[model samples]
Target: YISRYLTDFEPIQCLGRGGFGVVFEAKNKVDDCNYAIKRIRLPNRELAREKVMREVKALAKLEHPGIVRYFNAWLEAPPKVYLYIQMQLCRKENLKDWMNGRCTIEERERSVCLHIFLQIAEAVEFLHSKGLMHRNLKPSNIFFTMDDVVKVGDFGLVTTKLYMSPEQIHGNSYSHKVDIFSLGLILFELLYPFSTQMERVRTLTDVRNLKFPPLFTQKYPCEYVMVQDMLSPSPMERPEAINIIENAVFEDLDFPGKTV
Candidate 1:
């Protein structure tokens, strides 16, 4: 890794890391602004450089409140090929942190979580329509603006060991549909109102095996059905993100309180 490329900026700290890439919360001395930099170590090949370049444009072209807005991107064709991406700095925190003490059985409060999920669904719907997927999608990969807006990050690449789908785990053909499965898992996490970390873990395992405990089924009927549809074992059975956008469940939450 070379420090020469980001010479104009001072890296505050690393935001996250993964295969062949890392994100840094950095300060741009040039503009005197703080933004997130996604650094990707690309293959030292001309074709790979073009592909990466092509995508930065497409990813930057994406505009939505639920998306991590990319402002600029460039590549260093140096001794070690590197791609640098400039974007917003979500200092408020990611969903992984925000979701920590938030899950509960109380319907009124849980609607907040559902709203977060809905924002992401709308973003993913638009992303897929543009013929690109977040590729790495999960709670940790989702960040929040200072205004509490959900922002899906990391359009970079790969199947995270924990959030990967059955098709990804097995050596099989897959596409953007893998994203639907990952989204299902996220929805599962949001829907299940667990009392302890152990409860979350156990239910996650059971749900992966296509089992939903009695509490989930009976307590949250609408959510239970939606999560079931999203977590469908067959990729084709899972609804696309837009279909999720149009789901009736999101309606009631628009006007909370009183008899339904």
Candidate 2:
């Protein structure tokens, strides 16, 4: 149930709309700060309540620079929408947005890619430590702040199989290894735009045999090997997110560092 008096925040603009909910850029009247309001509407009030509560509980406990900051969450009534979750506004754009026009690895700096991957790895490792799966991890779900800080958001319980692990796709119980597989796909797409060489497969067998294009393999031999390890066919074979960070080839690379 929502409050009849809605004065604490004012919606400034609609950021985007999707199947699960609508997102709005809003102003916090009390603190005069900006926030992204995600409003999820479900016909079943009980379902909406439960989901919103769960999301809020998980988000509130997360306190890492790489993860989005959660400000507030509440149910509304009177006019009665389902739920509202207030979060930090990432105005810069998402990984998918940055990847839109750049077509080749030559167009991007390897250092930049390394930085983003490290940040994401850190974020995923934190989530796994808290027993959260992030169930959906993809380019679009990863947002960047104005300072190029990677803030992983959209931790909804939805699955986009293109970036899902083989065990997840097979309807088998899995662990945080699923995120490692998604990280591999993300790094691949970051280095190379979606192409025939990077197309997703339907089965674990095909994924096991998946290969990086010759151009990528020849240029980023070590990084290619790292991605392969992340995309290993067996969940047990995939490296943990923490291991990915420590073993990443960008050991000597200088990261500009992120702003919390």
Candidate 3:
């Protein structure tokens, strides 16, 4: 069956690799079109079967333009591993990479950034509507298009409950709010660091002084003000992803406008 799915064409080159499998930029020699292929070596045929079922379950229950589209998945094995993935080959650099080299952001750049944020916000809102939470919402998990359209990828970490607040850290259940929390952390990093990853969830002090290596130091007059709100201590106080789209991003489009 694995050979049935794969063709005679040798893969062109490796595009990326992950813990479970490696992705290749490949083509259907017959059709001459390119597609990304993930090869999972399924030697333990039994476990591979379970993994395939789980992957199918995760991929089957969703549909959104901003979510990666699932194509057929198959197993390759001299060793019996499971190869799972979606078909989207036009890889664009993530927001993390986009901001890395830039010193200062302009109005156009800000608008584009906000738009990407808004797209992620809407997708998270939709996922929450389905009682799902993307437990991992990082730059690497987001994919961009040539037109700069953003899409949420890798639903592997989604969960069925809400997350713990900054107050109740240890014993809380995971939830949709956790997705909001991750989104906030991501936006904070994007706006303040402008180009780097921030610290992990440490103490409350770390929570308080988020966005370190801050781009500007004017306190209340800069982008950090908005980012601070996102890093609030009370998870309940944090805006819902959809509410963020409406008020924080859409209504307040001139977010942290240059005060100079």
Q: Say which candidate scores most in lDDT.
A: 1
Candidate 3 RMSD to the correct structure: 6.2
lDDT per residue (tens digit) for residues 62-160 in model 2: 899999988887777653465788888886457876776565655567877787788888899999988887878988789877677899988342224
**How do the predictions measure up, each by TM-score?**
0.83, 0.85, 0.72
Better of 2 and 3 by TM-score: 2
Estimate candidate 2's alpha-carbon lDDT, on a 0 to 1 scale: 0.75
Residue 15 lDDT (model 3): 69
| lDDT (Cα, 0-100) at 89 in candidate 1 | 81
Task: Show model 1 residue runs off by greater than 4 Å.
Answer: 1-7, 44-51, 77-79, 103-108, 155-160, 194-198, 252-260
lDDT of 1 by residue, 1-260 (tens): 55654688987887677766887888888788898788898867789768877877787788888888888887776647678888988854567666675655563355666787888898889889988877667887787786777888763333234567788788788878778877877887776666676877777878877688887678778877887787777989988998888988777564354224
Every candidate's lDDT: 0.76, 0.75, 0.58
Q: Please give the range of 10 consecutive residues that has the lowest summed lDDT in model 3.
A: 155-164
Kindly indicate the candidate among 1 and 2 with the higher TM-score.
2
